[PDB]
Design an enzyme around this catalytic site. Structure first.
Site, PDB file in Angstrom:
ATOM      1  N   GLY C  54       0.787  -1.222   0.000  1.00 38.35           N
ATOM      2  CA  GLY C  54       0.000   0.000   0.000  1.00 38.35           C
ATOM      3  C   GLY C  54       0.820   1.273   0.000  1.00 38.35           C
ATOM      4  N   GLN C  55       0.803   1.998  -1.118  1.00 37.26           N
ATOM      5  CA  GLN C  55       1.390   3.329  -1.191  1.00 37.26           C
ATOM      6  C   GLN C  55       0.889   3.885  -2.522  1.00 37.26           C
ATOM      7  OE1 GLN C  55       3.603   4.055  -3.795  1.00 37.26           O
ATOM      8  NE2 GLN C  55       5.475   5.052  -3.064  1.00 37.26           N
ATOM      9  N   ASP C  56       0.925   5.215  -2.667  1.00 38.73           N
ATOM     10  CA  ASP C  56       0.265   5.882  -3.791  1.00 38.73           C
ATOM     11  C   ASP C  56       0.818   5.440  -5.145  1.00 38.73           C
ATOM     12  OD1 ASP C  56      -1.744   7.735  -2.684  1.00 38.73           O
ATOM     13  OD2 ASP C  56      -0.032   8.644  -1.657  1.00 38.73           O
TER      14      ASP C  56
END
Lengths: 174, 731, 165
Positions: C54-56
């Site tokens: 999870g990260q942009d």
């Protein structure tokens, strides 16, 4: 130098054991006798070749083992392990060419032996053979060349090597 | 001279495994023989020339290992192993990494059909069969230095595992004897280096310091792969690493990856606390002038990746910050129509972070065996829409990335070994990395192997029945006992002598009869094994110099053997007639037999007595009295205590015939062994107490009591100041 | 042959749980490097589980795989009160993409053995599952070693899928 010897005996012994399923006793004797020592200079060189002589001389054995033994002798004289420094090298070469003239043991082994005779007689060490042995050599190559039943390509092998040994013999009138 | 280079290139093409379909096995045999007979003529001189040595080092050993691996034909393997043995014999000094790999792998397949194993054993026997010295030499080249894995100790352990007849089920009969020949030659040779060096004189060189340092490394690695936090501090305490700084930790981890477990590094490295270790370790690698796929290959070849996603995110984020600054930036030469240009791609750290994640995405989606839905090139190309300062990527670039991953995986080769297609990378990984003094090496060589070999030999000694193999085993065991005695290895020597004493078949019906005959005597005489066991067991006793080596149970076995020998009237009890002559006393009272017939009753038939006569001649030839007691060294307080303890205090119904006789015999021995004993201050009380307590046993005929009183006065003469016992005797 | 994602923070617990699920019969050699890809069988159902970070920036790369995906899993530790603030940010971030209308969502509150483990109701209150609507969710408690109701969670997933399909 000694590695190649018991190497060759290992190869011929395993070939004999594979094919079979009197010579192996002396063969293992050769193995055990050459295991201990470091260099061949201590001992005579007739006994190390003697089991090879016994197998190649007699005719009771098929072409596989005698071909392997003749290739062994080819390796012996190619690597020059039986040097003039070794003891009784004259007797070893004399015994080799005496036993080799008896063309008994299909056509591969004949070319192997006649190539071996070429390599011995052409070499300087072939000058040490006696008159009887070299006369018997000439007799057996003549018998090979004269024949018509045998393959023609083997006949040309005999023709060429006969030319070679004749040149080597007749160079000696000086 | 360049023609030699071209010729060896041609033979490389002949022998190499890529050209399998376009060549026959006869041609491969011929090529094998060609390089084999070429090596013999100018073997060592190939070391001087660098290019030819490189050609014989890296690729041709890839060929030789591929051929010995996946070959079924016997003649082909017969030709293949010959070149390998000659290369070990001549050029073994320089290219020893490949030799270690070959020996570990060939021994791995060896200890898993029968004929291939037989040929492999018969050909690999070449190495030790040249002379015993090689078996020492491999210790001081492979196992001594810490960089390389252990070979020699694994060599002995595997070989002596193979020497058992138990392998006859899984191997043909030709393997055990040639297997045993190597160990027999080794132990026989080790006896040769014994006579010159004195026992007391020997009891370290810089070479063995490496061996001392190595042994903690294995335990350290085991503790490290057990858990990460306990490994580094003990290691730094040992001082292999320069200090506790992360720079030195990275310096360790980059260089010696082969020693450590890859999964341990994968688990440790992704820990969120040690980000500084992440940065420091990432700096060590180089990525200059390489494509991105080669960069990830160089990254992951050194250590296994962790499974879970956020750890991959952390590791590639660590990668990008160094890979961006590793490559110099030239915005002027940016181009699109150019092809096969490394400098055209100059991605921002976030851009190459995304790309580095992208190749991992490709590998996992395409080549994972579980995922049924393979990837497609078009959707993959579209997936990176606007990921280099908000712009698309070159078509040829991502096309080459996809082609490279399609052609070949991203995975470390060491775990996924054995597959036919995979040996290229596994082989390529390794080469990127590149008289008194003689005895000192051998202590460790025994210290790891000494029990196992003995056990194997004893198994054969229990299984074999031929006379020649049994006596060869016995003399080799005698020489092994010599080696153990001289090297001052106690428990091992006790193991040989205890196993012999169990095998001699004298340490536990028909009663005794006149040339005594008994169950033990007939069992001794008829059996050849124990017959030959006794003579060696009492030949080894004579030559012992240092009596400290013997243990309690060994001495107990000795007294049990001598007592059981004397039980059946085999050995006359006059071990010390000189003591009797000095003390001017008659011989012992011999123990009576049950029945005495001179020369349906159970007479021992004429077919039964010959065993007793043969046992008589063997025990007389053994010279027992001169052996155990005749030699001066074996007399020790342990022998006195164990012998005098082993007297039979109680008189059951069965032991009536020899009770007083053995009672006198034990003390008659102990007087002489006390007399030759040097110190007498301490043990004198012990022997006095035991003898006087033994004298108070009831039911003894008056003759033996008259004999027993004669010893007591001589004891009180020898021993010191025991007034109470003398008063008791007088009273 | 369906796909499910899984998201969390603690690698060891997630890996141990994932090894715990896959036991119908184990005859294999080694998995490939990269992301954990595992199988789980159940009466009349078989599923494949992938992992997700999870990260942009990288979640754009995960987008196309969501075309066939329909499920999501979580792992949350008990005595990890400090890093719930990091976890719930990722939980809200996963809701950000609007193409996930058919995304089944689960929770596996691993290590429900220690005495300081927050209650399931308190787990809901801290994670903040009350103030959202218009999607299906489920929450469940499990233990790594002893195990508790994991198969009930898979049964809930199967019943939800049969309700959908």
């Amino acid at each position: 130098p000694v590695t190649i010897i018991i190497k060759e005996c290992i190869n011929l012994s395993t070939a004999m054991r594979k094919y079979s399923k009197p010579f192996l006793s002396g063969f293992i004797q050769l193995r055990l006798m050459l295991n201990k020592l470091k260099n061949l200079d201590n001992i005579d060189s007739l006994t190390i070749l003697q089991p090879f002589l016994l197998i190649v001389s007699t005719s009771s054995i098929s072409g596989y083992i005698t071909s392997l033994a003749l290739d062994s002798l080819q390796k012996f004289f190619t690597l020059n392990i039986i040097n003039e420094s070794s003891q009784n090298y004259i007797g070893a070469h004399r015994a080799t060419v005496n036993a080799l003239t008896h063309c008994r043991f299909d056509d591969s082994v004949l070319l192997k032996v006649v190539f071996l005779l070429r390599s011995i007689v052409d070499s300087p060490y072939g000058d040490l053979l006696s008159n009887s042995i070299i006369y018997d050599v000439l007799q057996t190559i003549l018998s090979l060349a004269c024949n018509n039943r045998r393959s023609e390509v083997l006949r040309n092998a005999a023709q060429s090597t006969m030319i070679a040994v004749t040149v080597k013999i007749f160079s000696k009138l000086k | 001279l360049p023609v030699v280079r071209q010729y060896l290139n041609l033979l490389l093409s002949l022998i190499a495994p890529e050209n399998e379909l376009k060549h026959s096995y006869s041609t491969r045999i011929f090529g094998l023989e060609l390089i084999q007979t070429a090596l013999e003529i100018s073997g060592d001189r190939l070391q001087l020339y660098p290019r030819l040595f490189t050609l014989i080092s890296d690729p041709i050993f890839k060929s030789i290992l591929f051929i010995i691996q996946n070959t079924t034909k016997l003649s082909l393997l017969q030709a293949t192993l010959q070149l390998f043995t000659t290369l070990v014999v001549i050029l073994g000094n320089n290219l020893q990494l490949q030799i270690e790999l070959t020996l570990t792998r060939i021994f791995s397949i060896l200890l898993d059909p029968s004929i291939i194993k037989e040929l492999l054993i018969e050909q690999i026997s070449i190495l030790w069969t040249r002379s015993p010295s090689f078996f020492t030499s491999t210790f001081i080249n492979f196992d001594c230095n810490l960089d390389r894995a252990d070979v020699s100790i694994n060599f002995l352990k595997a070989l002596t595992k193979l020497a058992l007849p138990e392998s006859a089920l899984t191997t043909t009969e030709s393997v055990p004897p040639i297997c045993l020949e190597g160990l027999v030659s080794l132990v026989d040779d080790m006896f040769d280096h014994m006579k010159d060096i004195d026992r007391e004189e020997f009891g370290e060189m810089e070479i063995l310091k490496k061996r001392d340092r190595k042994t903690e490394f294995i335990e350290c690695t085991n503790a490290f792969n057990e858990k990460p936090k306990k490994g580094i501090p003990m290691l730094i305490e040992k001082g292999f690493i320069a200090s506790d700084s992360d720079k030195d930790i990275a310096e360790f981890l980059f260089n010696n990856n082969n020693r450590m477990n890859k999964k341990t590094i994968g688990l440790l490295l992704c820990h969120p606390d040690k980000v500084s270790l992440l940065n420091e370790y990432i700096r060590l690698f180089d990525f200059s002038g390489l494509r991105v796929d080669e960069a990830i290959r160089i990254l992951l070849t050194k250590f296994r990746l962790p499974g879970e996603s956020q750890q991959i995110e952390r590791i590639i984020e660590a990668f990008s910050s160094a890979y961006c600054e590793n490559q110099d930036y030239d915005p002027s030469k940016i181009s699109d129509n150019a092809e096969d240009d490394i400098s055209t791609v100059q991605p921002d750290a976030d851009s190459v972070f995304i790309l580095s994640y992208s190749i991992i995405m490709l590998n996992t989606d395409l080549h994972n065996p579980q995922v049924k839905e393979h990837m497609s090139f078009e959707d993959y190309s579209g997936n990176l829409k606007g990921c280099c300062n908000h712009k698309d990527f070159p078509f040829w670039y991502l096309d080459r990335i996809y082609c490279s991953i399609r052609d070949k995986e991203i995975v470390m080769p060491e775990e996924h070994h054995g597959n036919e297609k995979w040996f290229e990378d596994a082989w390529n990984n390794l080469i990127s990395s590149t008289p008194l003094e003689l005895l000192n090496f051998d202590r460790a060589i025994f210290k790891q192997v000494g029990p196992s070999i003995v056990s194997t030999l004893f198994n054969i000694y229990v299984v074999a029945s031929d006379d020649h193999i049994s006596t060869r085993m016995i003399t080799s065991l005698d020489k092994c006992s010599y080696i153990s005695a001289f090297f001052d290895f106690k428990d091992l020597f006790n193991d040989i002598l205890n196993s012999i004493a169990k095998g001699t078949t004298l340490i536990n019906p028909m009663p005794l009869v006149q040339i005594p005959v008994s169950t033990d005597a007939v069992r001794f005489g008829r059996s050849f094994k124990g017959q030959l066991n006794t003579v060696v067991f009492f030949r080894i006793i004579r030559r012992n110099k240092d009596p400290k080596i013997f243990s309690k149970e060994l001495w107990l076995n000795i007294v049990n053997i001598i007592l059981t020998l004397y039980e059946d009237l085999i050995l006359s009890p006059d071990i010390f007639p000189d003591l009797q002559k000095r003390l001017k006393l008659s011989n012992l009272p011999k123990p009576s037999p049950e029945i005495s017939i001179n020369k349906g009753d159970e007479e021992p038939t004429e077919e039964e007595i010959k065993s007793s006569k043969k046992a008589m001649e063997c025990i007389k030839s053994s010279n027992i009295a001169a052996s155990v007691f005749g030699n001066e060294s074996n007399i020790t307080a342990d022998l006195i205590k164990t012998l005098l303890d082993s007297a039979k205090t109680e008189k059951n119904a069965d032991n009536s015939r020899y009770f007083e006789a053995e009672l006198l015999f034990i003390i008659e021995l102990t007087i002489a062994l006390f007399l030759f004993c040097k110190e007498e201050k301490e043990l004198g009380k012990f022997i006095l107490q035991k003898v006087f307590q033994l004298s108070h046993t009831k039911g003894l005929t008056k003759r033996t009591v008259r004999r027993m009183l004669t010893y007591k006065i001589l004891l009180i003469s020898l021993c010191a100041d025991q007034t109470e016992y003398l008063s008791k005797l007088i009273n | 042959e369906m796909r499910i994602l899984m998201v969390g923070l603690d690698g060891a617990g997630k890996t141990t749980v994932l090894y715990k699920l896959k036991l119908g019969e184990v005859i294999t050699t080694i998995p490939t490097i990269g992301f954990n890809v595992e199988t789980v069988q159940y009466k009349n159902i078989s599923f494949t589980v992938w992992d997700v970070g999870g990260q942009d920036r990288i979640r754009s790369l995960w987008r196309h795989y969501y075309r066939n995906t329909e499920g999501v899993i979580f792992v949350v530790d008990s005595n990890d009160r400090s890093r719930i603030g990091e976890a719930r940010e990722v939980m809200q971030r996963m809701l950000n993409e609007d193409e996930l209308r058919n995304a089944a969502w689960l929770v596996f509150a691993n290590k429900q053995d220690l005495p300081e483990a927050m209650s399931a109701a308190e787990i809901t209150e801290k994670l903040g599952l009350h103030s959202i609507r218009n999607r299906p969710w489920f929450i469940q408690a499990t233990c790594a070693t002893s195990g508790e109701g994991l198969y009930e969670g898979l049964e809930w997933l199967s019943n939800s899928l049969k309700n959908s399909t």
